[PDB]
């Protein structure tokens, strides 16, 4: 997160921190969010050979008694996930066991009107600048949902599938490692951090959750 502030600890109890062993071996981290006791929603490009989720965290380098660390038993990448167009960057993770709902660990509701111009919030443990490490503490920033035309420089941007997030006239932005985290507008999950410019200039591109709700329901109903 760039230009944000440290979250009040545990004030965003749906937040998941993902440790990912990629197929090759090198580790990666992403954000995500709890939507059922045993399901986390995140970005598909965060898939790997194995994933562990940490719920209830604030400083991710220091365990607290609020922590629930759960192994992922199955990854469900969207079937149309496309590395050429970067479309359909969304994935459900089934946890090996159900998390316990507590004050520090809870689920995030879905919606079902947010047009360009609305102010949203995104939280994550991603890098806090181009030459900065990931943040040890959960950070959050308020970002403007932009008209899709503000992302017209991104090849293949599709307003039906994606959101354009972050005023280009300011430096505030989601950034590397915030991928998979939710964009919250009016207390509902509206987007998932997907990608952006390496040089951190907003806007960034998010997956539009509303478009995928029937797929999410399909996966949940079959589990
Ligand atoms: C996040 O937690 C880590 C680990 O406890 C903190 O880093 C430690 O900080 C203490 C001083 O407070 C040092 O003596 C240790 O050497 C640090 N450990 C490591 C692994 O670096 C860190 O300060 C915490 N971050 C915040 C913002 O509170
Ligand atoms: C990723 O998206 C690309 C572009 O839409 C897909 O390639 C197109 O696939 C259709 C299949 O009917 C063809 O008609 C086009 O000619 C293809 N375009 C190009 C540039 O090859 C591609 O198949 C998708 N990949 C996945 C994994 O679904
Ligand atoms: C390192 P990261 O956080 O995981 C992120 C990334 O590489 N996204 C890739 C997406 C994607 C989507 C579909 C695909 F099929 C696919 F192969 C990849 C990233 C790189 S620069 C940047 C700047 C702002 C933000 Cl928010 C994230 C990013």
PDB file of C-alpha atoms and ligand atoms in Angstrom:
ATOM      1  CA  UNK A   1       0.000   0.000   0.000  1.00  0.00           C
ATOM      2  CA  UNK A   2       1.389   3.426  -0.974  1.00  0.00           C
ATOM      3  CA  UNK A   3       0.382   6.639   0.805  1.00  0.00           C
ATOM      4  CA  UNK A   4      -1.749   4.807   3.331  1.00  0.00           C
ATOM      5  CA  UNK A   5      -1.860   4.519   7.113  1.00  0.00           C
ATOM      6  CA  UNK A   6      -1.454   1.629   9.534  1.00  0.00           C
ATOM      7  CA  UNK A   7      -4.747  -0.123  10.205  1.00  0.00           C
ATOM      8  CA  UNK A   8      -6.179  -0.230  13.679  1.00  0.00           C
ATOM      9  CA  UNK A   9      -5.140  -3.754  14.643  1.00  0.00           C
ATOM     10  CA  UNK A  10      -7.817  -6.358  13.944  1.00  0.00           C
ATOM     11  CA  UNK A  11     -10.239  -3.733  12.634  1.00  0.00           C
ATOM     12  CA  UNK A  12     -10.453  -5.650   9.339  1.00  0.00           C
ATOM     13  CA  UNK A  13     -11.012  -9.190  10.611  1.00  0.00           C
ATOM     14  CA  UNK A  14     -11.713 -10.696   7.167  1.00  0.00           C
ATOM     15  CA  UNK A  15      -8.171  -9.948   5.967  1.00  0.00           C
ATOM     16  CA  UNK A  16      -6.069 -12.976   5.000  1.00  0.00           C
ATOM     17  CA  UNK A  17      -2.311 -13.064   4.497  1.00  0.00           C
ATOM     18  CA  UNK A  18      -1.268 -15.737   1.973  1.00  0.00           C
ATOM     19  CA  UNK A  19       2.074 -17.510   1.949  1.00  0.00           C
ATOM     20  CA  UNK A  20       2.467 -19.224  -1.399  1.00  0.00           C
ATOM     21  CA  UNK A  21       4.980 -21.789  -2.521  1.00  0.00           C
ATOM     22  CA  UNK A  22       5.106 -21.363  -6.273  1.00  0.00           C
ATOM     23  CA  UNK A  23       5.458 -24.433  -8.517  1.00  0.00           C
ATOM     24  CA  UNK A  24       9.195 -23.676  -8.955  1.00  0.00           C
ATOM     25  CA  UNK A  25       9.748 -23.239  -5.227  1.00  0.00           C
ATOM     26  CA  UNK A  26      10.280 -19.520  -4.600  1.00  0.00           C
ATOM     27  CA  UNK A  27       7.816 -18.078  -2.089  1.00  0.00           C
ATOM     28  CA  UNK A  28       5.359 -15.271  -2.795  1.00  0.00           C
ATOM     29  CA  UNK A  29       2.832 -13.463  -0.631  1.00  0.00           C
ATOM     30  CA  UNK A  30      -0.612 -12.056  -1.398  1.00  0.00           C
ATOM     31  CA  UNK A  31      -3.632 -10.698   0.384  1.00  0.00           C
ATOM     32  CA  UNK A  32      -7.064 -12.308   0.380  1.00  0.00           C
ATOM     33  CA  UNK A  33     -10.250 -12.248   2.389  1.00  0.00           C
ATOM     34  CA  UNK A  34     -12.432 -14.710   4.291  1.00  0.00           C
ATOM     35  CA  UNK A  35     -15.919 -15.152   2.791  1.00  0.00           C
ATOM     36  CA  UNK A  36     -16.997 -18.378   4.521  1.00  0.00           C
ATOM     37  CA  UNK A  37     -15.460 -20.084   7.533  1.00  0.00           C
ATOM     38  CA  UNK A  38     -13.578 -22.383   5.136  1.00  0.00           C
ATOM     39  CA  UNK A  39     -13.258 -20.233   2.003  1.00  0.00           C
ATOM     40  CA  UNK A  40     -10.892 -17.390   1.162  1.00  0.00           C
ATOM     41  CA  UNK A  41     -11.209 -15.236  -1.939  1.00  0.00           C
ATOM     42  CA  UNK A  42      -8.037 -13.931  -3.609  1.00  0.00           C
ATOM     43  CA  UNK A  43      -6.412 -13.351  -7.019  1.00  0.00           C
ATOM     44  CA  UNK A  44      -5.730 -16.303  -9.353  1.00  0.00           C
ATOM     45  CA  UNK A  45      -2.192 -15.131 -10.119  1.00  0.00           C
ATOM     46  CA  UNK A  46      -1.477 -15.916  -6.455  1.00  0.00           C
ATOM     47  CA  UNK A  47      -1.880 -19.666  -7.107  1.00  0.00           C
ATOM     48  CA  UNK A  48       0.998 -21.987  -6.286  1.00  0.00           C
ATOM     49  CA  UNK A  49       1.935 -25.516  -5.361  1.00  0.00           C
ATOM     50  CA  UNK A  50       0.737 -24.907  -1.817  1.00  0.00           C
ATOM     51  CA  UNK A  51      -0.740 -22.058   0.176  1.00  0.00           C
ATOM     52  CA  UNK A  52      -1.119 -21.269   3.850  1.00  0.00           C
ATOM     53  CA  UNK A  53      -3.471 -18.538   5.057  1.00  0.00           C
ATOM     54  CA  UNK A  54      -3.017 -16.479   8.207  1.00  0.00           C
ATOM     55  CA  UNK A  55      -6.193 -14.917   9.634  1.00  0.00           C
ATOM     56  CA  UNK A  56      -6.393 -12.583  12.630  1.00  0.00           C
ATOM     57  CA  UNK A  57      -3.036 -10.924  11.908  1.00  0.00           C
ATOM     58  CA  UNK A  58      -1.763  -7.383  12.137  1.00  0.00           C
ATOM     59  CA  UNK A  59       2.033  -7.483  12.276  1.00  0.00           C
ATOM     60  CA  UNK A  60       2.676 -10.498  10.053  1.00  0.00           C
ATOM     61  CA  UNK A  61       6.161 -11.126  11.482  1.00  0.00           C
ATOM     62  CA  UNK A  62       4.838 -11.527  15.036  1.00  0.00           C
ATOM     63  CA  UNK A  63       2.252 -14.054  16.140  1.00  0.00           C
ATOM     64  CA  UNK A  64      -0.657 -13.049  18.388  1.00  0.00           C
ATOM     65  CA  UNK A  65      -3.274 -15.222  20.110  1.00  0.00           C
ATOM     66  CA  UNK A  66      -5.841 -13.965  17.557  1.00  0.00           C
ATOM     67  CA  UNK A  67      -3.967 -15.828  14.801  1.00  0.00           C
ATOM     68  CA  UNK A  68      -5.505 -18.715  12.926  1.00  0.00           C
ATOM     69  CA  UNK A  69      -3.123 -20.219  10.406  1.00  0.00           C
ATOM     70  CA  UNK A  70      -4.834 -22.706   8.097  1.00  0.00           C
ATOM     71  CA  UNK A  71      -3.609 -24.802   5.204  1.00  0.00           C
ATOM     72  CA  UNK A  72      -5.419 -24.571   1.883  1.00  0.00           C
ATOM     73  CA  UNK A  73      -6.748 -27.992   0.791  1.00  0.00           C
ATOM     74  CA  UNK A  74      -7.863 -26.910  -2.688  1.00  0.00           C
ATOM     75  CA  UNK A  75      -7.372 -24.001  -5.073  1.00  0.00           C
ATOM     76  CA  UNK A  76     -10.106 -23.070  -7.533  1.00  0.00           C
ATOM     77  CA  UNK A  77      -8.713 -20.656 -10.132  1.00  0.00           C
ATOM     78  CA  UNK A  78     -11.289 -19.178 -12.447  1.00  0.00           C
ATOM     79  CA  UNK A  79     -11.414 -21.498 -15.511  1.00  0.00           C
ATOM     80  CA  UNK A  80     -10.850 -18.597 -17.931  1.00  0.00           C
ATOM     81  CA  UNK A  81      -7.826 -17.192 -16.103  1.00  0.00           C
ATOM     82  CA  UNK A  82      -5.754 -15.767 -18.950  1.00  0.00           C
ATOM     83  CA  UNK A  83      -2.078 -14.785 -18.789  1.00  0.00           C
ATOM     84  CA  UNK A  84      -2.252 -13.026 -22.164  1.00  0.00           C
ATOM     85  CA  UNK A  85      -5.110 -10.636 -21.395  1.00  0.00           C
ATOM     86  CA  UNK A  86      -4.736 -10.763 -17.597  1.00  0.00           C
ATOM     87  CA  UNK A  87      -8.478 -11.391 -17.356  1.00  0.00           C
ATOM     88  CA  UNK A  88     -10.369 -13.426 -14.779  1.00  0.00           C
ATOM     89  CA  UNK A  89      -7.805 -12.945 -12.014  1.00  0.00           C
ATOM     90  CA  UNK A  90      -9.882 -14.508  -9.240  1.00  0.00           C
ATOM     91  CA  UNK A  91      -9.541 -17.668  -7.154  1.00  0.00           C
ATOM     92  CA  UNK A  92     -11.297 -19.396  -4.284  1.00  0.00           C
ATOM     93  CA  UNK A  93      -9.309 -21.264  -1.646  1.00  0.00           C
ATOM     94  CA  UNK A  94     -10.910 -23.985   0.455  1.00  0.00           C
ATOM     95  CA  UNK A  95      -9.285 -24.166   3.894  1.00  0.00           C
ATOM     96  CA  UNK A  96      -8.471 -27.603   5.331  1.00  0.00           C
ATOM     97  CA  UNK A  97     -10.581 -26.728   8.386  1.00  0.00           C
ATOM     98  CA  UNK A  98     -13.168 -24.069   9.218  1.00  0.00           C
ATOM     99  CA  UNK A  99     -11.812 -20.944  10.876  1.00  0.00           C
ATOM    100  CA  UNK A 100     -13.433 -19.978  14.170  1.00  0.00           C
ATOM    101  CA  UNK A 101     -15.351 -16.723  13.967  1.00  0.00           C
ATOM    102  CA  UNK A 102     -13.976 -14.391  16.620  1.00  0.00           C
ATOM    103  CA  UNK A 103     -13.617 -10.650  17.117  1.00  0.00           C
ATOM    104  CA  UNK A 104     -10.345 -10.791  15.173  1.00  0.00           C
ATOM    105  CA  UNK A 105     -11.486 -13.245  12.494  1.00  0.00           C
ATOM    106  CA  UNK A 106     -14.691 -12.781  10.532  1.00  0.00           C
ATOM    107  CA  UNK A 107     -16.226 -12.953   7.075  1.00  0.00           C
ATOM    108  CA  UNK A 108     -16.741 -10.173   4.515  1.00  0.00           C
ATOM    109  CA  UNK A 109     -20.211  -9.813   2.912  1.00  0.00           C
ATOM    110  CA  UNK A 110     -20.884  -9.476  -0.788  1.00  0.00           C
ATOM    111  CA  UNK A 111     -23.136  -6.761  -2.249  1.00  0.00           C
ATOM    112  CA  UNK A 112     -26.256  -7.156  -4.461  1.00  0.00           C
ATOM    113  CA  UNK A 113     -24.671   0.785  -6.873  1.00  0.00           C
ATOM    114  CA  UNK A 114     -21.052   1.946  -6.983  1.00  0.00           C
ATOM    115  CA  UNK A 115     -20.254   4.090 -10.026  1.00  0.00           C
ATOM    116  CA  UNK A 116     -16.949   5.783 -10.856  1.00  0.00           C
ATOM    117  CA  UNK A 117     -16.244   8.548  -8.360  1.00  0.00           C
ATOM    118  CA  UNK A 118     -17.025   6.523  -5.227  1.00  0.00           C
ATOM    119  CA  UNK A 119     -14.355   6.438  -2.523  1.00  0.00           C
ATOM    120  CA  UNK A 120     -13.222   2.958  -1.524  1.00  0.00           C
ATOM    121  CA  UNK A 121     -10.686   1.433   0.854  1.00  0.00           C
ATOM    122  CA  UNK A 122      -8.060  -1.241   0.289  1.00  0.00           C
ATOM    123  CA  UNK A 123      -5.814  -2.869   2.878  1.00  0.00           C
ATOM    124  CA  UNK A 124      -2.710  -5.002   2.486  1.00  0.00           C
ATOM    125  CA  UNK A 125       0.821  -5.956   3.503  1.00  0.00           C
ATOM    126  CA  UNK A 126       2.293  -5.023   0.113  1.00  0.00           C
ATOM    127  CA  UNK A 127       5.295  -2.796  -0.638  1.00  0.00           C
ATOM    128  CA  UNK A 128       4.934   0.810   0.568  1.00  0.00           C
ATOM    129  CA  UNK A 129       6.910   2.208  -2.348  1.00  0.00           C
ATOM    130  CA  UNK A 130       8.823   1.206  -5.452  1.00  0.00           C
ATOM    131  CA  UNK A 131      12.057   0.477  -3.595  1.00  0.00           C
ATOM    132  CA  UNK A 132      10.461  -0.554  -0.314  1.00  0.00           C
ATOM    133  CA  UNK A 133       9.874  -3.971   1.283  1.00  0.00           C
ATOM    134  CA  UNK A 134       6.413  -5.309   2.057  1.00  0.00           C
ATOM    135  CA  UNK A 135       4.905  -3.766   5.200  1.00  0.00           C
ATOM    136  CA  UNK A 136       5.079  -5.825   8.377  1.00  0.00           C
ATOM    137  CA  UNK A 137       1.836  -4.235   9.594  1.00  0.00           C
ATOM    138  CA  UNK A 138      -1.471  -4.182   7.741  1.00  0.00           C
ATOM    139  CA  UNK A 139      -1.868  -0.819   5.956  1.00  0.00           C
ATOM    140  CA  UNK A 140      -4.939   0.778   4.387  1.00  0.00           C
ATOM    141  CA  UNK A 141      -5.600   3.576   1.928  1.00  0.00           C
ATOM    142  CA  UNK A 142      -8.648   5.401   0.578  1.00  0.00           C
ATOM    143  CA  UNK A 143      -8.826   5.333  -3.221  1.00  0.00           C
ATOM    144  CA  UNK A 144     -11.171   6.761  -5.829  1.00  0.00           C
ATOM    145  CA  UNK A 145     -12.909   4.371  -8.158  1.00  0.00           C
ATOM    146  CA  UNK A 146     -12.100   5.868 -11.565  1.00  0.00           C
ATOM    147  CA  UNK A 147     -13.987   5.840 -14.829  1.00  0.00           C
ATOM    148  CA  UNK A 148     -12.825   2.812 -16.854  1.00  0.00           C
ATOM    149  CA  UNK A 149     -11.443   5.299 -19.381  1.00  0.00           C
ATOM    150  CA  UNK A 150      -8.798   6.245 -16.788  1.00  0.00           C
ATOM    151  CA  UNK A 151      -7.317   2.768 -17.354  1.00  0.00           C
ATOM    152  CA  UNK A 152      -7.360   2.959 -21.150  1.00  0.00           C
ATOM    153  CA  UNK A 153      -3.539   2.764 -21.202  1.00  0.00           C
ATOM    154  CA  UNK A 154      -3.788  -0.777 -19.820  1.00  0.00           C
ATOM    155  CA  UNK A 155      -4.034  -3.150 -22.795  1.00  0.00           C
ATOM    156  CA  UNK A 156      -7.153  -5.325 -22.652  1.00  0.00           C
ATOM    157  CA  UNK A 157      -8.765  -3.486 -19.735  1.00  0.00           C
ATOM    158  CA  UNK A 158     -12.449  -4.483 -19.775  1.00  0.00           C
ATOM    159  CA  UNK A 159     -14.903  -2.430 -17.720  1.00  0.00           C
ATOM    160  CA  UNK A 160     -17.232  -5.444 -17.352  1.00  0.00           C
ATOM    161  CA  UNK A 161     -14.511  -7.559 -15.771  1.00  0.00           C
ATOM    162  CA  UNK A 162     -12.327  -5.034 -14.031  1.00  0.00           C
ATOM    163  CA  UNK A 163     -12.271  -1.886 -11.914  1.00  0.00           C
ATOM    164  CA  UNK A 164      -9.938   1.085 -12.374  1.00  0.00           C
ATOM    165  CA  UNK A 165      -8.753   2.232  -8.950  1.00  0.00           C
ATOM    166  CA  UNK A 166      -6.683   5.198  -7.765  1.00  0.00           C
ATOM    167  CA  UNK A 167      -6.571   8.868  -8.785  1.00  0.00           C
ATOM    168  CA  UNK A 168      -3.636   9.308 -11.207  1.00  0.00           C
ATOM    169  CA  UNK A 169      -3.052  12.839  -9.917  1.00  0.00           C
ATOM    170  CA  UNK A 170      -2.033  11.472  -6.514  1.00  0.00           C
ATOM    171  CA  UNK A 171       0.503   8.901  -5.379  1.00  0.00           C
ATOM    172  CA  UNK A 172      -1.853   6.801  -3.208  1.00  0.00           C
ATOM    173  CA  UNK A 173      -2.214   3.281  -4.590  1.00  0.00           C
ATOM    174  CA  UNK A 174      -2.402  -0.455  -4.017  1.00  0.00           C
ATOM    175  CA  UNK A 175       0.985  -1.940  -4.960  1.00  0.00           C
ATOM    176  CA  UNK A 176       3.057  -5.160  -5.195  1.00  0.00           C
ATOM    177  CA  UNK A 177       1.913  -7.732  -2.627  1.00  0.00           C
ATOM    178  CA  UNK A 178      -1.499  -6.145  -2.049  1.00  0.00           C
ATOM    179  CA  UNK A 179      -2.779  -8.452  -4.841  1.00  0.00           C
ATOM    180  CA  UNK A 180      -5.749 -10.569  -3.733  1.00  0.00           C
ATOM    181  CA  UNK A 181      -6.930  -8.078  -1.119  1.00  0.00           C
ATOM    182  CA  UNK A 182     -10.486  -6.687  -1.259  1.00  0.00           C
ATOM    183  CA  UNK A 183     -11.585  -3.224  -2.363  1.00  0.00           C
ATOM    184  CA  UNK A 184     -14.299  -2.218   0.072  1.00  0.00           C
ATOM    185  CA  UNK A 185     -16.926   0.316  -0.939  1.00  0.00           C
ATOM    186  CA  UNK A 186     -19.759   0.928   1.535  1.00  0.00           C
ATOM    187  CA  UNK A 187     -18.823  -2.126   3.605  1.00  0.00           C
ATOM    188  CA  UNK A 188     -19.090  -4.593   0.730  1.00  0.00           C
ATOM    189  CA  UNK A 189     -16.397  -6.390  -1.254  1.00  0.00           C
ATOM    190  CA  UNK A 190     -16.433  -4.744  -4.707  1.00  0.00           C
ATOM    191  CA  UNK A 191     -13.051  -5.674  -6.094  1.00  0.00           C
ATOM    192  CA  UNK A 192      -9.868  -7.735  -5.794  1.00  0.00           C
ATOM    193  CA  UNK A 193      -6.428  -6.157  -6.228  1.00  0.00           C
ATOM    194  CA  UNK A 194      -4.975  -7.519  -9.499  1.00  0.00           C
ATOM    195  CA  UNK A 195      -2.139  -5.554 -11.119  1.00  0.00           C
ATOM    196  CA  UNK A 196      -0.716  -2.154 -11.977  1.00  0.00           C
ATOM    197  CA  UNK A 197       2.362  -0.291 -13.137  1.00  0.00           C
ATOM    198  CA  UNK A 198       5.790  -1.365 -11.855  1.00  0.00           C
ATOM    199  CA  UNK A 199       6.529   2.303 -11.152  1.00  0.00           C
ATOM    200  CA  UNK A 200       3.543   2.528  -8.779  1.00  0.00           C
ATOM    201  CA  UNK A 201       1.724   5.311 -10.644  1.00  0.00           C
ATOM    202  CA  UNK A 202      -2.068   4.825 -10.148  1.00  0.00           C
ATOM    203  CA  UNK A 203      -4.544   3.783 -11.247  1.00  0.00           C
ATOM    204  CA  UNK A 204      -4.244   0.032 -10.675  1.00  0.00           C
ATOM    205  CA  UNK A 205      -6.523  -2.678 -12.048  1.00  0.00           C
ATOM    206  CA  UNK A 206      -8.823  -4.728  -9.830  1.00  0.00           C
ATOM    207  CA  UNK A 207     -11.103  -7.665 -10.578  1.00  0.00           C
ATOM    208  CA  UNK A 208     -14.783  -6.632 -10.497  1.00  0.00           C
ATOM    209  CA  UNK A 209     -16.385  -8.959  -7.954  1.00  0.00           C
ATOM    210  CA  UNK A 210     -20.015  -8.499  -9.003  1.00  0.00           C
ATOM    211  CA  UNK A 211     -19.271 -10.060 -12.413  1.00  0.00           C
ATOM    212  CA  UNK A 212     -18.029 -13.263 -10.782  1.00  0.00           C
ATOM    213  CA  UNK A 213     -20.630 -13.765  -8.060  1.00  0.00           C
ATOM    214  CA  UNK A 214     -22.468 -16.486  -9.998  1.00  0.00           C
ATOM    215  CA  UNK A 215     -19.158 -18.384 -10.396  1.00  0.00           C
ATOM    216  CA  UNK A 216     -18.378 -17.950  -6.699  1.00  0.00           C
ATOM    217  CA  UNK A 217     -21.844 -19.327  -5.924  1.00  0.00           C
ATOM    218  CA  UNK A 218     -21.293 -22.243  -8.306  1.00  0.00           C
ATOM    219  CA  UNK A 219     -18.065 -23.208  -6.513  1.00  0.00           C
ATOM    220  CA  UNK A 220     -19.522 -22.787  -3.031  1.00  0.00           C
ATOM    221  CA  UNK A 221     -22.662 -24.797  -3.837  1.00  0.00           C
ATOM    222  CA  UNK A 222     -20.579 -27.717  -5.119  1.00  0.00           C
ATOM    223  CA  UNK A 223     -18.534 -27.785  -1.904  1.00  0.00           C
TER     224      UNK A 223
HETATM  225  C1  LIG B   1       6.600  -6.371  13.887  1.00  0.00           C
HETATM  226  O1  LIG B   1       7.061  -7.447  14.695  1.00  0.00           O
HETATM  227  C2  LIG B   1       8.464  -7.605  14.571  1.00  0.00           C
HETATM  228  C3  LIG B   1       8.932  -8.887  15.267  1.00  0.00           C
HETATM  229  O2  LIG B   1       8.607  -8.850  16.643  1.00  0.00           O
HETATM  230  C4  LIG B   1       9.184  -6.374  15.131  1.00  0.00           C
HETATM  231  O3  LIG B   1      10.573  -6.484  14.910  1.00  0.00           O
HETATM  232  C5  LIG B   1      11.396  -6.783  16.075  1.00  0.00           C
HETATM  233  O4  LIG B   1      11.513  -5.517  16.691  1.00  0.00           O
HETATM  234  C6  LIG B   1      12.295  -5.552  17.873  1.00  0.00           C
HETATM  235  C7  LIG B   1      12.279  -4.190  18.562  1.00  0.00           C
HETATM  236  O5  LIG B   1      10.957  -3.837  18.907  1.00  0.00           O
HETATM  237  C8  LIG B   1      13.724  -5.971  17.548  1.00  0.00           C
HETATM  238  O6  LIG B   1      14.467  -6.102  18.746  1.00  0.00           O
HETATM  239  C9  LIG B   1      13.758  -7.292  16.792  1.00  0.00           C
HETATM  240  O7  LIG B   1      15.059  -7.506  16.287  1.00  0.00           O
HETATM  241  C10 LIG B   1      12.763  -7.288  15.635  1.00  0.00           C
HETATM  242  N1  LIG B   1      12.637  -8.623  15.076  1.00  0.00           N
HETATM  243  C11 LIG B   1      12.771  -8.810  13.765  1.00  0.00           C
HETATM  244  C12 LIG B   1      12.427 -10.169  13.230  1.00  0.00           C
HETATM  245  O8  LIG B   1      13.164  -7.922  13.010  1.00  0.00           O
HETATM  246  C13 LIG B   1       8.684  -5.110  14.443  1.00  0.00           C
HETATM  247  O9  LIG B   1       9.179  -3.967  15.110  1.00  0.00           O
HETATM  248  C14 LIG B   1       7.163  -5.059  14.424  1.00  0.00           C
HETATM  249  N2  LIG B   1       6.719  -3.941  13.608  1.00  0.00           N
HETATM  250  C15 LIG B   1       6.038  -2.931  14.136  1.00  0.00           C
HETATM  251  C16 LIG B   1       5.724  -1.791  13.207  1.00  0.00           C
HETATM  252  O10 LIG B   1       5.683  -2.897  15.319  1.00  0.00           O
HETATM  253  C1  LIG B   2      -6.617 -15.967 -23.620  1.00  0.00           C
HETATM  254  O1  LIG B   2      -7.256 -14.952 -24.370  1.00  0.00           O
HETATM  255  C2  LIG B   2      -6.866 -14.996 -25.735  1.00  0.00           C
HETATM  256  C3  LIG B   2      -7.368 -13.760 -26.487  1.00  0.00           C
HETATM  257  O2  LIG B   2      -8.772 -13.647 -26.400  1.00  0.00           O
HETATM  258  C4  LIG B   2      -7.329 -16.317 -26.358  1.00  0.00           C
HETATM  259  O3  LIG B   2      -6.951 -16.391 -27.716  1.00  0.00           O
HETATM  260  C5  LIG B   2      -8.017 -16.218 -28.691  1.00  0.00           C
HETATM  261  O4  LIG B   2      -8.715 -17.441 -28.598  1.00  0.00           O
HETATM  262  C6  LIG B   2      -9.820 -17.503 -29.476  1.00  0.00           C
HETATM  263  C7  LIG B   2     -10.517 -18.844 -29.266  1.00  0.00           C
HETATM  264  O5  LIG B   2     -11.752 -18.858 -29.945  1.00  0.00           O
HETATM  265  C8  LIG B   2      -9.400 -17.320 -30.937  1.00  0.00           C
HETATM  266  O6  LIG B   2     -10.552 -17.125 -31.731  1.00  0.00           O
HETATM  267  C9  LIG B   2      -8.465 -16.129 -31.135  1.00  0.00           C
HETATM  268  O7  LIG B   2      -7.863 -16.186 -32.411  1.00  0.00           O
HETATM  269  C10 LIG B   2      -7.383 -16.127 -30.066  1.00  0.00           C
HETATM  270  N1  LIG B   2      -6.556 -14.940 -30.149  1.00  0.00           N
HETATM  271  C11 LIG B   2      -5.235 -15.061 -30.130  1.00  0.00           C
HETATM  272  C12 LIG B   2      -4.442 -13.789 -30.141  1.00  0.00           C
HETATM  273  O8  LIG B   2      -4.677 -16.158 -30.100  1.00  0.00           O
HETATM  274  C13 LIG B   2      -6.698 -17.480 -25.602  1.00  0.00           C
HETATM  275  O9  LIG B   2      -7.143 -18.727 -26.104  1.00  0.00           O
HETATM  276  C14 LIG B   2      -7.027 -17.347 -24.120  1.00  0.00           C
HETATM  277  N2  LIG B   2      -6.350 -18.373 -23.352  1.00  0.00           N
HETATM  278  C15 LIG B   2      -7.004 -19.082 -22.435  1.00  0.00           C
HETATM  279  C16 LIG B   2      -6.163 -19.855 -21.461  1.00  0.00           C
HETATM  280  O10 LIG B   2      -8.233 -19.114 -22.361  1.00  0.00           O
HETATM  281  C1  LIG B   3       3.580  -8.577  -7.582  1.00  0.00           C
HETATM  282  P1  LIG B   3       1.802  -8.511  -7.565  1.00  0.00           P
HETATM  283  O1  LIG B   3       1.302  -7.747  -6.389  1.00  0.00           O
HETATM  284  O2  LIG B   3       1.357 -10.017  -7.488  1.00  0.00           O
HETATM  285  C2  LIG B   3       1.174  -7.747  -9.111  1.00  0.00           C
HETATM  286  C3  LIG B   3       1.186  -8.818 -10.263  1.00  0.00           C
HETATM  287  O3  LIG B   3       2.190  -9.193 -10.816  1.00  0.00           O
HETATM  288  N1  LIG B   3      -0.100  -8.981 -10.856  1.00  0.00           N
HETATM  289  C4  LIG B   3      -0.372  -9.867 -11.940  1.00  0.00           C
HETATM  290  C5  LIG B   3      -1.645 -10.067 -12.313  1.00  0.00           C
HETATM  291  C6  LIG B   3      -2.081 -11.131 -13.244  1.00  0.00           C
HETATM  292  C7  LIG B   3      -3.417 -11.280 -13.653  1.00  0.00           C
HETATM  293  C8  LIG B   3      -3.802 -12.279 -14.535  1.00  0.00           C
HETATM  294  C9  LIG B   3      -2.821 -13.129 -15.035  1.00  0.00           C
HETATM  295  F1  LIG B   3      -3.157 -14.093 -15.883  1.00  0.00           F
HETATM  296  C10 LIG B   3      -1.493 -13.003 -14.640  1.00  0.00           C
HETATM  297  F2  LIG B   3      -0.586 -13.858 -15.136  1.00  0.00           F
HETATM  298  C11 LIG B   3      -1.110 -12.003 -13.754  1.00  0.00           C
HETATM  299  C12 LIG B   3       1.771  -6.395  -9.478  1.00  0.00           C
HETATM  300  C13 LIG B   3       2.866  -6.153 -10.238  1.00  0.00           C
HETATM  301  S1  LIG B   3       3.194  -4.487 -10.492  1.00  0.00           S
HETATM  302  C14 LIG B   3       1.837  -3.985  -9.559  1.00  0.00           C
HETATM  303  C15 LIG B   3       1.439  -2.666  -9.315  1.00  0.00           C
HETATM  304  C16 LIG B   3       0.315  -2.421  -8.542  1.00  0.00           C
HETATM  305  C17 LIG B   3      -0.364  -3.545  -8.060  1.00  0.00           C
HETATM  306 CL1  LIG B   3      -1.806  -3.267  -7.144  1.00  0.00          CL
HETATM  307  C18 LIG B   3       0.016  -4.845  -8.289  1.00  0.00           C
HETATM  308  C19 LIG B   3       1.140  -5.109  -9.067  1.00  0.00           C
END
